[PDB]
Amino acid sequence: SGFRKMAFPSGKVEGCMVQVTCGTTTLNGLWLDDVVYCPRHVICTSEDMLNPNYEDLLIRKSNHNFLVQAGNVQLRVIGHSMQNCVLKLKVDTANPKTPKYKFVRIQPGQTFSVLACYNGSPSGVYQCAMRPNFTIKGSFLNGSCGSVGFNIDYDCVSFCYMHHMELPTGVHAGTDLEGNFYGPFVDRQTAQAAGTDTTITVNVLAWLYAAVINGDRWFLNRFTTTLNDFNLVAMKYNYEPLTQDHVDILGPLSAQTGIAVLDMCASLKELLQNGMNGRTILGSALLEDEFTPFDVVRQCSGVTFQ
Amino acid sequence: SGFRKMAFPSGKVEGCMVQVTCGTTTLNGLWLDDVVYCPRHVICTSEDMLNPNYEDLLIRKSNHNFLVQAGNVQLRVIGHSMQNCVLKLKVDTANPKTPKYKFVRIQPGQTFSVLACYNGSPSGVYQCAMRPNFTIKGSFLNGSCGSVGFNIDYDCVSFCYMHHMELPTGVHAGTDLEGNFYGPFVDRQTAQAAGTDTTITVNVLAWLYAAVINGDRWFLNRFTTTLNDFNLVAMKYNYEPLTQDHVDILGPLSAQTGIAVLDMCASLKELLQNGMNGRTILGSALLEDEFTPFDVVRQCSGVTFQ
Ligand SMILES: *C(=N)[C@H](C[C@@H]1CCCNC1=O)NC(=O)[C@@H]1[C@@H]2[C@H](CN1C(=O)[C@@H](NC(=O)C(F)(F)F)C(C)(C)C)C2(C)C
Numbered sequence: 001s002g003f004r005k006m007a008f009p010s011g012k013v014e015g016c017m018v019q020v021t022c023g024t025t026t027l028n029g030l031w032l033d034d035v036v037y038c039p040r041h042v043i044c045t046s047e048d049m050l051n052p053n054y055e056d057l058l059i060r061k062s063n064h065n066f067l068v069q070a071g072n073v074q075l076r077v078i079g080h081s082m083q084n085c086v087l088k089l090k091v092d093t094a095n096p097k098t099p100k101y102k103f104v105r106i107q108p109g110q111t112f113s114v115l116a117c118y119n120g121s122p123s124g125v126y127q128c129a130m131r132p133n134f135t136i137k138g139s140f141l142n143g144s145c146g147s148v149g150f151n152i153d154y155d156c157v158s159f160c161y162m163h164h165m166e167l168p169t170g171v172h173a174g175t176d177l178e179g180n181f182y183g184p185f186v187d188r189q190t191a192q193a194a195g196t197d198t199t200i201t202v203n204v205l206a207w208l209y210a211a212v213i214n215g216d217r218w219f220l221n222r223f224t225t226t227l228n229d230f231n232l233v234a235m236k237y238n239y240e241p242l243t244q245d246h247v248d249i250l251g252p253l254s255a256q257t258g259i260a261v262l263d264m265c266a267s268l269k270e271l272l273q274n275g276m277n278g279r280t281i282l283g284s285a286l287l288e289d290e291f292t293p294f295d296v297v298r299q300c301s302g303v304t305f306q
Numbered sequence: 307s308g309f310r311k312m313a314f315p316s317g318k319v320e321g322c323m324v325q326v327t328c329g330t331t332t333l334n335g336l337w338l339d340d341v342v343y344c345p346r347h348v349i350c351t352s353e354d355m356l357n358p359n360y361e362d363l364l365i366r367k368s369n370h371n372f373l374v375q376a377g378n379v380q381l382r383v384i385g386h387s388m389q390n391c392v393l394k395l396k397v398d399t400a401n402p403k404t405p406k407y408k409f410v411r412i413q414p415g416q417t418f419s420v421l422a423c424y425n426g427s428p429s430g431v432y433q434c435a436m437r438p439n440f441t442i443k444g445s446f447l448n449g450s451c452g453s454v455g456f457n458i459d460y461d462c463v464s465f466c467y468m469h470h471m472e473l474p475t476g477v478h479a480g481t482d483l484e485g486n487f488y489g490p491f492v493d494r495q496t497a498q499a500a501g502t503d504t505t506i507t508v509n510v511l512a513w514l515y516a517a518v519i520n521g522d523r524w525f526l527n528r529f530t531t532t533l534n535d536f537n538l539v540a541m542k543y544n545y546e547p548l549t550q551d552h553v554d555i556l557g558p559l560s561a562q563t564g565i566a567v568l569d570m571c572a573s574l575k576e577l578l579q580n581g582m583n584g585r586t587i588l589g590s591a592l593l594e595d596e597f598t599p600f601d602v603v604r605q606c607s608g609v610t611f612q
């Protein structure tokens with residue numbers, strides 16, 4: 001038993017982290033086969049940050065202007081190009097530690113692990129959700145850009161996030177590995193704010209099932225609700241609409257516990273309207289929305305990765 | 307900015323995980339140089355669990371009775387011995403991925419990362435604290451025994467925990483890597499309960515400093531207190547005594563923020579007496595005690611490991 005916010009093992013990604021320096025700026029890059037992927041703002045000076053013309057700046061760069069290091073080893077850059085907000089640096093050496101991998105654009109509500117890195121070296125690993133407003137609630141300092149987020153399935157690493165910037169609330173924004181931002185953000189030091197966020201309803205339901213599986217059942221009531229009536233309540237409390245797709249995805253947990261999804265919806269309705277009265281669920285005083293249904297099943301069934 | 311419960315990167319430990327099977331029982335082992343360390347109850351049948359005589363059971367085992375697998379590769383066992391509640395299986399192959407490592411017995415209040423494993427394969431990584439009552443609040447299923455906990459410093463992995471069992475509250479107990487249990491527990495299926503736990507005061511103070519560093523300062527008041535008077539209040543709320551050693555350890559964070567430790571103690575006193583009135587600190591509705599002062603500094607300063 002027990003339920004923790006658990007990250008994927010990071011070893012396969014650790015072997016891909018490198019340092020990229022251009023001029024005075026150093027950040028992290030991701031080395032896969034003979035390409036290093038990093039945020040394009042590595043080619044900026046501090047002054048270039050209000051409104052850089054990245055296409056112009058890169059025109060004046062040569063391969064030798066990019067210093068790439070894997071541990072102590074220098075990797076010679078033999079070509080370079082820009083794809084949206086990422087640079088692709090071709091190097092003369094293929095990474096011998098390249099895992100089986102894919103590039104994926106994740107959907108809001110989905111979770112992934114972040115391997116926080118500085119100077120090409122890993123600092124720590126933690127699990128995040130793509131928020132409905134296309135931010136993540138991370139932990140990132142100067143020099144962390146190019147740190148990546150990923151999921152693992154069996155032996156395949158699906159890279160889904162590259163870190164680029166921090167927004168006023170202390171929340172974080174970045175791109176997929178093709179360099180397209182999540183959300184309406186741009187890689188320049190101008191006034192930008194996250195949109196209003198919302199709570200990921202299907203994930204809260206998943207975590208309530210995890211609670212039942214671990215024996216924390218005080219919040220289960222005797223009622224049911226319709227989907228439409230539940231979503232009228234969810235809306236008032238800034239929760240995402242629950243769709244039939246979401247209900248279908250919760251099927252496995254509903255089957256395991258014998259609690260119909262709409263019965264769990266009635267129990268969540270009561271929590272939203274009445275609060276928890278100082279009680280906790282799985283050790284938490286707030287409702288948790290950063291576990292997907294798949295996260296719950298994988299952790300409660302012991303899925304492993306090779 | 308941001309503050310997350312962050313685990314160490316797990317790659318160095320991933321390379322050390324193996325599967326150990328004896329008879330019908332399979333669990334995890336730790337392969338370092340030419341030795342595999344695992345819980346001794348691998349040699350038990352389900353019936354042997356109420357009160358096994360481990361010394362007797364091991365007498366009847368031969369090297370070939372232990373099937374050790376690293377990935378798909380079998381590792382031939384060429385000797386075996388017991389040290390307290392762990393078995394040491396000498397194998398014919400030294401692990402080529404052995405990191406620089408130490409075995410350490412951690413103190414209550416200290417934190418470490420757990421690499422949860424099944425069948426020798428990693429499932430996930432999360433950060434835990436050794437509770438004052440010598441348990442941890444983990445996430446562990448059948449087959450997880452032999453999963454380890456560790457800290458990293460630079461390139462050195464300090465292994466501090468091996469998982470053995472689950473106690474009635476859904477909390478977890480295990481040994482150091484010399485096989486000595488943390489706390490008054492034994493590796494047998496008999497009635498055992500965790501002692502009453504207490505809150506790790508120095509760690510709560512550390513996390514309040516982390517909050518200030520991230521800009522969450524509403525709970526700072528204008529008062530100070532003496533050490534003695536603070537500990538009278540801490541005692542009532544089941545908090546550990548704060549010692550001068552603890553105050554000295556908080557020195558770096560106190561210097562960084564300019565808030566004297568005893569001034570922070572006065573603010574914590576008020577939180578304990580008055581509650582949070584529905585406010586959060588670093589996103590939490592409860593006071594957090596599983597970050598050490600070193601954890602806070604490392605995460606807020608970006609310490610990395612090579
Ligand atoms: C990558 N190394 C760095 C990560 C930041 C560093 C500050 C603390 N937390 C982080 O995630 N990225 C950047 O510094 C980055 C780059 C330049 C500015 N910027 C920002 O994150 C800025 N934020 C914003 O401009 C905005 F509010 F719009 F989000 C701040 C003000 C430095 C945080 C560009 C966007 C190219």
Ligand SMILES: *C(=N)[C@H](C[C@@H]1CCCNC1=O)NC(=O)[C@@H]1[C@@H]2[C@H](CN1C(=O)[C@@H](NC(=O)C(F)(F)F)C(C)(C)C)C2(C)C
Pocket residue numbers: 001333347355446447448449450451452469470471472473474478492493494495496497498
């Ligand atoms: C290791 N594979 C396994 C881990 C358990 C499995 C159950 C769910 N969570 C876990 O951490 N360890 C054991 O099964 C183990 C071994 C045998 C029984 N035991 C227990 O953990 C039991 N707990 C207790 O006896 C006690 F309450 F005293 F802590 C339970 C009842 C199976 C949980 C021995 C101690 C040799």
